[PDB]
Amino acid sequence: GSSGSSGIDVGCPVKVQLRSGEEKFPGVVRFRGPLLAERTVSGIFFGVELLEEGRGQGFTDGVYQGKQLFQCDEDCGVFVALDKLELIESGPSSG
User: Fold this and answer.
1) Can you give the residue ranges of the CAP-Gly domain?
2) Overall domain count for the chain
3) Which of these, 74, 52, 53, lies nearest to 62 by C-alpha position?
């Protein structure tokens, strides 16, 4: 189903792009909520935990500017806009 709606929320696997079109690491959403306020860009941040594929590429690590939004492993937690996240199908096996 890809009509043009989608919808990522807490507890969902999605690919996160750290660099500018380099590689999107898969991860499950742990939290969701903005951060800045008319300082750079109006976009909601989505906390996603990097999977074994892109494990070891987290900056927030569950904490942002001292505020512990969510809990995750070392270099796993990461916040990004929905547009940055990539909805992945939960049906690897289908016949």
Assistant:
1) 36-81
2) 1
3) 74
Residues in Cβ contact with 67 at an 8 Å cutoff, skipping those fewer than 6 apart = none
Structural domain range at position 23? 1-95
Rg (CA), the chain: 13
Cα separation, 70 vs 73, in Å, equals: 10
Q: Pick from 66, 91, 70: which is nearest to 79 by CA?
A: 70
Q: How was this structure determined?
A: NMR
Q: Give residues after which the chain gaps, C-N over 2.5 angstroms.
A: none
Nearest to 32 by CA among 85, 89, 76, 75: 85
* C-alpha–C-alpha distance, residues 67 and 9, integer Å: 20
